[PDB]
Write a protein that binds this ligand. Structure first.
Ligand code: HEM
Ligand code: HEM
Lengths: 247, 248
């Protein structure tokens, strides 16, 4: 760690000040120097013989990668503000799924947490659902009280407490069978490969393609890296820094 | 194909009738016989000139596996009824997750679809969430209007249209810091390995452990394999067969 300490103190002092402020609410730190790194995080020293420990978002399994993980953490402070990059991540994130989770309000007054197959044509997204499923009644009766969530697989996520997610308050509407329907479905068949029952449900008339018109969105890709979305506008949510601990 | 047809006609005639009834709502079929199998499904012939095609829930890439895939589908008709086996699968399914999806009702009136880390002390399950998140207001103000979903990862599922899932109408209640909190949190650290920020959020006072009391549940593990659950009782939902296409 001796070499790492030298490296950080020589090229990432301003980043460390950024980390101290963002994660520790330490605003006027002096004598900022890198103290250590271990498989789970780093320790930054400052001021009156003090330190702030900041954990990585995963365990770094090989000591050979401690340096890069530390650099990534230091660079995350400014990267948080690369809105163009976040916008591109959001687009690519959505393209990596063939299904989404939903919250709907059923006519029985109870919320419903479910999931449905996701399809798309251009920038238009849709879900394909059956009248037999509990979420159908809510999509039909409360079409504008719906939230759609793109949630990263637990097995692909950094940890159980940081699964990347993209959520949108959504207005829904039914799409009748026809040209629009076939374009979305053919696209789904091509992308997925079309096996597994997909061909069967296309012919089941109790299934409906429902367009998703997204309104307010919230994207979370890392600790202290949450964003609000609306149309083509995206804004970082934490200019004030760590809000936890009743900050 | 000749050997597979011969095998199915000699050993699975009753299963094929079961599949015709279940998936095709064909009840008085005669002259039932196995017709073919391909990478995506099987075809059963019946009557003078009719057939029913039933797709596998995944593509069988190697023809060496067609017979087993076919036998699996045939045997699924009766296996669907094994409630003791389903009970076992449900318990094991929940133990395979360290997080769940949630639907909550925000005080403003809109529903919220989110997710939270999942913890437990034996049979008691809990979630751990922060006051900074939108689902907190619904968990605090509409604590008995919540649905928890255990959803299989898309990358592990048979397909996009068949991700296994277990959903429960749930009543929630807050757990104060103390011995119960520590038991659940310590168990979570030991299970997950405790890296990635878990240790940091334990100390954040804006986070609360919330116990989940599951009520009605619905488990879906395959096509035509959906079950209703309430406490210690489980029941198969499809006695009437394929409900799709407005079969009523
Ligand atoms: C022929 C092949 C079948 C296919 C491809 C198929 C497909 C599907 C799909 C994709 C859904 C999800 C709908 C949604 O979430 O909106 C579904 C739900 C359902 N299916 Fe089927 N199904 C088939 C046969 C059956 C049969 C034979 C039964 C009954 C014995 C059945 C009973 C159900 C029930 C009860 C649900 C609702 C499950 C839930 O709680 O989400 N299905 N089916
Ligand atoms: C010290 C490291 C941090 C850790 C371990 C951490 C952890 C978490 C966790 C686990 C959640 C999800 C809570 C829930 O869904 O109930 C969360 C949410 C959130 N955090 Fe942090 N956080 C950290 C720092 C920060 C900082 C520095 C900011 C602000 C600049 C921040 C802003 C937020 C916001 C806005 C949310 C809500 C996200 C959402 O919509 O789901 N966090 N944080």
């Amino acid at each position: 760690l001796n070499r790492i300490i030298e490296h950080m103190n020589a090229h990432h002092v301003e980043d460390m000040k950024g980390l101290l402020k963002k994660f520790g609410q330490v605003h006027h730190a002096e004598n900022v120097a890198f103290k250590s790194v271990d498989s789970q995080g780093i320790v930054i020293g400052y001021n009156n013989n003090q330190t702030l420990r900041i954990e990585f978002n995963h365990e770094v399994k090989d000591p050979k990668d401690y340096k890069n993980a530390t650099i990534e953490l230091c660079q995350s402070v400014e990267k948080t503000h690369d809105l163009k990059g976040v916008e591109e991540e959001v687009k690519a994130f959505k393209e990596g799924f063939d299904s989404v989770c939903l919250a709907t309000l059923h006519p029985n007054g109870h919320v419903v947490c479910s999931y449905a197959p996701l399809m798309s044509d251009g920038k238009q997204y849709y879900i394909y659902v059956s009248e037999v499923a509990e979420h159908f009644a809510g999509l039909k009766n409360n079409p504008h009280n719906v939230e759609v969530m793109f949630l990263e697989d637990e097995s692909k996520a950094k940890s159980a407490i940081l699964r990347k997610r993209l959520r949108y308050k959504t207005n829904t509407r039914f799409i009748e069978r026809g040209a629009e329907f076939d374009k979305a479905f053919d696209s789904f068949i091509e992308k997925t490969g079309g096996a597994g029952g997909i061909k069967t449900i296309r012919a089941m008339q109790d299934f409906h393609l429902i367009a998703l018109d997204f309104k307010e969105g919230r994207f979370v890709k890392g600790f202290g890296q949450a964003y609000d979305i609306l149309g083509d506008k995206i804004a970082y949510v934490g200019d004030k820094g760590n809000p936890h601990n009743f900050a």
